[PDB]
Write a protein that binds this ligand. Structure first.
Ligand SMILES: [Cl-]
Ligand SMILES: [Cl-]
Ligand SMILES: [Zn+2]
Ligand SMILES: [Zn+2]
Ligand SMILES: [Zn+2]
Ligand SMILES: [Zn+2]
Lengths: 222, 222, 222, 222
């Protein structure tokens, strides 16, 4: 049936125990938040930012979507981004992908004629896919999957650094770091894919694509 | 400072501890997921569904965005909805507001001219607000804010119920329930705000706006 | 066949004759534009702004979409809007709907379970539809159609006036007028539906919905 | 001054004159349309397709936006595409750039941090640009600009060809052609920039990016 009681009971029991252990647990954040992190990751049920990073409420503001995609043209994601950088002044942006990611697999195998919105949505994976024909072809179904997940992370990290929000934030001395990481559903573990990026100079050193040229294109002409 | 091992270490501990409490915790999801719930909640750092419902991985699919908004025209949220209803066949949609929600307050206070993407993104909140002008007219700041949060949850439940994905699932005799819940950051407590909605009938009984009339409007033309 | 030659020939013959009649016809706008109008109307093949208003190149900048819809959350439309108000400094915004509009009919009759993107897209028509149960019910299929087209015009005019672009433009003394009009495919004719709106005071007088309250909501509380 | 009769009068004259040249000009479309073309062009005031192609009403369905961009994820343009391909069964998609396009220049010159929605919207242009960095590296301002316009038209042709709506039409043996055209505001002249594309074959022959590989990428995995 559709009854919520065992869900709510489970909630109750959880909140009961947290306040028991630390009394200000909830009350400190009853009227405000001051998270340090923004996390962008996949909507996937195996990937709970707070749980995997063992965080308590108030620590990590979270955008989650299918494929952990970041696009200037997505107001959903860009809103979580604007708000946390400009208003909450967070310090760290975690861009998190995960092995076994359906959106990455779908991005690899589907035929664009596939119907529905998920397929509209994952067009960004296809774009990353297309730029890396060389890292992907003649790899096993499984290695391709893993590679695709990582390339996506790296592409999304780029997108975050190139976002007008992060770029305006850098232009005004606000400390903002951006981090490419990956999670393994089968192990609970997080490895760092790209070392911390804290401004242009870092991105120049750490990102395959050229952010400087992206930012200053006309400097590349006559 | 932006190092990340601290965190990375906290992840390790967590994953070992869980692997200690249970040997097949992570391993049983290495290569699939069968969650029963899709959750749509605020990206607010205080409100981590898997945590607050004491769920383990593989249990809840999560869309999180600024103001827990659901729109047919937002491909971000729509693809979480399609992929869970259609590929994953989840049984329960949780639509969760939370008190002290900045998006809800911003929808009461900002002038539409404010700049930025957040302001654009929370246009839906203003629309819920304009539609309920009278319920809100008169109340104190604090009261209005709380009322907005609640009207918003109800409006977002309605929008999930009215979405193409859900109507199509209902017309296909898919078992699928939709829940209006709110959460009190200052307490860790979730309260059911709207009883379970499992189809048109439930919704005709339970919602302040007319789903039937939304779904069959032309039947009432001459 | 797919050959363009009769299309290009037709173009050629057209450009030939225009330059023949007036030599600066094209050349004056070869390197720039200074249009006075922005037109927002339907993608419908019977509704060619320049032709119906007998305009020459450089006069009217044009957004056209299915249903002539205006939404803060649509970057396509909002871009045409931002650009012409902020950069080109246009004076007049024409919001134009048209009888026999499919998007309006579809908005009336379809069941939201309908598949595809057009149905996602016209959700705004349904929203206007829902607010006007009273002006529409027990009207003939045809009168309902016509009414729905007009209500949409009026709703879109509101949306344009409430847009952050138009609102910021008003706040800085920039003269900007907004106009609700309608076109008849079967007659070539344009009637004015709403008299010119040139700022708040006008909208207050000319729009059914309350723009002032929309702009200053908190002034409606305690 | 914002009166509107002037215009309204020009509309009258036009409509009488056309009704003079032909008695059933408007009347034959009063209650239907069967255009053969969908046109996707810049919202630029200088570029009115029905006018420049000397088409009468009922002949061209029109999407117009800032930079003639086509994205699977833009429901605005996508619904023009779906409704024309699927309901109307048009035969020819015209994808039209134009020289002296501000969006194309903005995609060369702006810094991603610029503010506003336009800048967000033209992210696609920057992506076409980054992908062709080398073709553009070195050229004069004037030359680059022209080159951007042309790379953009080709990229947008590719995106129409790769869209779900078109691939699905092609796989259904629908006759459907896609054309890359550019237009010179200073002359009234359209030039064919890419020969007609009527299916995969055409596109494999005619496009600089690999449609086949985009459509069947996984076939090249081990
Ligand atoms: Cl979460
Ligand atoms: Cl046009
Ligand atoms: Zn995933
Ligand atoms: Zn919130
Ligand atoms: Zn129409
Ligand atoms: Zn242009």
């Amino acid at each position: 049936t559709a009854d919520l009681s065992p869900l709510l009971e489970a909630n109750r029991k959880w909140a009961d125990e947290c306040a028991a252990k630390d009394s200000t647990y909830f009350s400190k954040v009853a009227g405000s938040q001051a998270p340090e992190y923004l996390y962008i990751g996949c909507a996937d049920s195996r990937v709970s930012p707070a749980q995997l990073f063992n965080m308590a409420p108030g620590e990590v503001f979270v955008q989650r979507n299918v494929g952990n995609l970041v696009s200037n043209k997505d107001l959903n994601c860009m809103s979580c981004l604007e708000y946390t950088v400009d208003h909450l002044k967070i310090k760290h942006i975690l861009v998190c992908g995960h092995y076994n990611c359906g959106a990455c697999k779908a991005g690899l195998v589907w035929h664009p004629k596939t119907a529905g919105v998920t397929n509209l949505w994952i067009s960004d994976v296809r774009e990353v896919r297309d730029k890396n024909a060389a890292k992907l072809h003649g790899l096993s179904a499984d290695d391709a999957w893993d590679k695709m997940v990582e390339l996506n992370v790296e592409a999304q990290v780029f997108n975050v650094c190139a976002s007008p929000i992060v770029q305006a934030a850098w232009a005004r001395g606000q400390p903002l770091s951006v981090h490419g990481i990956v999670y393994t559903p089968g192990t609970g573990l997080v490895k760092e894919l790209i070392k911390p990026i804290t401004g242009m100079e870092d991105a120049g050193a750490l990102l395959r694509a050229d952010l400087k040229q992206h930012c200053f294109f006309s400097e590349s002409l006559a």
